[PDB]
């Protein structure tokens, strides 16, 4: 038997959930289609200092555009990612809804909040605005699916919570699709400096 976790990947349509999970090349080529739910399960293997961990990532077929997701999608989820678009303020305002929809079925499973598309210059949702994770004591990460920026951070955090081992490390990065856009290393350092500053600012 293998150590695998069902990871539900939720968020508004157009936030980049499918682009994100597709970065993991073997998860993409070995994804499984669930006809009854219209879902694709990407087996995302990660290799830790204590062995392989497989995140079976559930990705929608775009049904989130027309309403909430059915129970079956959430059932037995052991962890989750809530994604939003840093270029669409409205997607950030729906994070609480997705959070509620998720906890209504799965209770206090580990959750990571991800703001996608940080490779874009015209960033609308800045670090100072992102506060929901602090209210619910969740972990947040900037990411850019199309540049593989911080791709492994959410999965590393989840694995540590799920295993109960804060010293857990990925010994090697999974084979990822080549970056389709460049992520200015400085812009990444500036965004990372904006998060730590925002982390040391009071909640309004």
């Amino acid at each position: 038997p293998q150590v695998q976790f069902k990871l539900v990947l939720v968020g508004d349509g157009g936030t980049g959930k499918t682009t994100f999970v597709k970065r993991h090349l073997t998860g993409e080529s070995e994804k499984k289609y669930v006809a009854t739910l219209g879902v694709e399960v990407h087996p995302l293997v990660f290799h830790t200092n204590r062995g392989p961990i497989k995140f079976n990532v559930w990705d929608t077929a775009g049904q989130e555009k027309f309403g909430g997701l059915r129970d079956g999608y959430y059932i037995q989820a052991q962890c989750a990612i809530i994604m939003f678009d840093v270029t669409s303020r409205v997607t950030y305002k729906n994070v609480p809804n997705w959070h509620r929809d998720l906890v209504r079925v799965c209770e206090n499973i580990p959750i990571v909040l991800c703001g996608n598309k940080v490779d874009i210059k015209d960033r609308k949702v800045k670090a100072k605005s992102i506060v929901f994770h602090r209210k619910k004591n969740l972990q947040y990460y900037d990411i850019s699916a199309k540049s593989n920026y911080n791709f492994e951070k959410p999965f590393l955090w989840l694995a540590r919570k799920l295993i109960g081992d804060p010293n857990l490390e990925f010994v090697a990065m999974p084979a990822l699709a080549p970056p389709e856009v460049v992520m200015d290393p400085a812009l990444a350092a500036q965004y990372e400096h904006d998060l730590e500053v925002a982390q040391t600012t009071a909640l309004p």
């Binding site: 038997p1 293998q2 150590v3 695998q4 069902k6 499984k32 669930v34 006809a35 009854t36 739910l37 879902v39 399960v41 087996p43 204590r50 062995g51 961990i53 079976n56 559930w58 079956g72 999608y73 059932i75 037995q76 295993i163």
Partner: protein, 38 residues
């Protein structure tokens, strides 16, 4: 120590061949996607 050294599926459980969710022995269908216990 490795997880696999101390990891074991609950007695009677079965992984769903369609969506990989782990189900109880008594369940004839998958509690997530409704597929049948193969």
């Amino acid at each position: 120590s490795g997880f696999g050294d101390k990891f074991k599926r609950p007695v009677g459980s079965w992984e769903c061949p369609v969506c990989c969710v782990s189900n109880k022995a008594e369940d004839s269908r998958c509690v997530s996607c409704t597929s049948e216990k193969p």
